[PDB]
Amino acid sequence: TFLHLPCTIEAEEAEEIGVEHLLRDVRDQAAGGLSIRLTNQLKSLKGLQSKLKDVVEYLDKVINKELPINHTILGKLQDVFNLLPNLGTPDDDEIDVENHDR
């Protein structure tokens, strides 16, 4: 079976100059001012939203349709719950001191 390798894409400095100037847009590989960085926060959150939905759905279709179990998916997603922050802890109180400072 096939093991996902993540990707980020790269080019030598030979190729790259021709990429940067041929492009005639804003670019998701570069950025300008504050205004573009407000855009980025909306786009980044939208990706989470869509991706969460796929996880729930996958959990549904396992107990409905009854596709075979994967402890690779279920096991990784077990970790997510212990990593999860919660509220009312001394840690969140330390965030608020930093928010006043900044």
Binding site: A14, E16, I17, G18, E20, H21, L22
Partner: protein
């Protein structure tokens, strides 16, 4: 910089014979820093074109502008052995 030597005129000449209109694109990639500078196209000028003034018929029915990347280097071969005309870039939206 983009210019042509004698040896490259001999190479140029036979592509001209094979395909009536043909171009030579010359890339100097170590005076290139915007991926676009010091890249020009060139094309043979005939010996008939100089003496009977049929050289600048390529300044007409086009934009009629030539944008230099090397002022010194282009101008030398612009009368001697080539005429340079400016280069453009393109893509479809799938590509972009």
């Amino acid at each position: 910089g983009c210019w042509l030597s004698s040896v490259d005129v001999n190479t140029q000449k036979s592509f001209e014979q094979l395909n009536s209109r043909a171009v030579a694109v010359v890339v100097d990639p170590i005076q290139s820093v915007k991926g676009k500078v010091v890249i020009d196209a060139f094309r043979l000028i005939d010996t008939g074109a100089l003496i009977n003034n049929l050289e600048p018929r390529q300044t007409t029915s086009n934009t009629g502008l030539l944008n230099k990347a090397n002022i010194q280097a282009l101008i030398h071969g612009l009368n001697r052995h080539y005429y340079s005309l400016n280069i453009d870039y393109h893509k479809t939206a799938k590509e972009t």
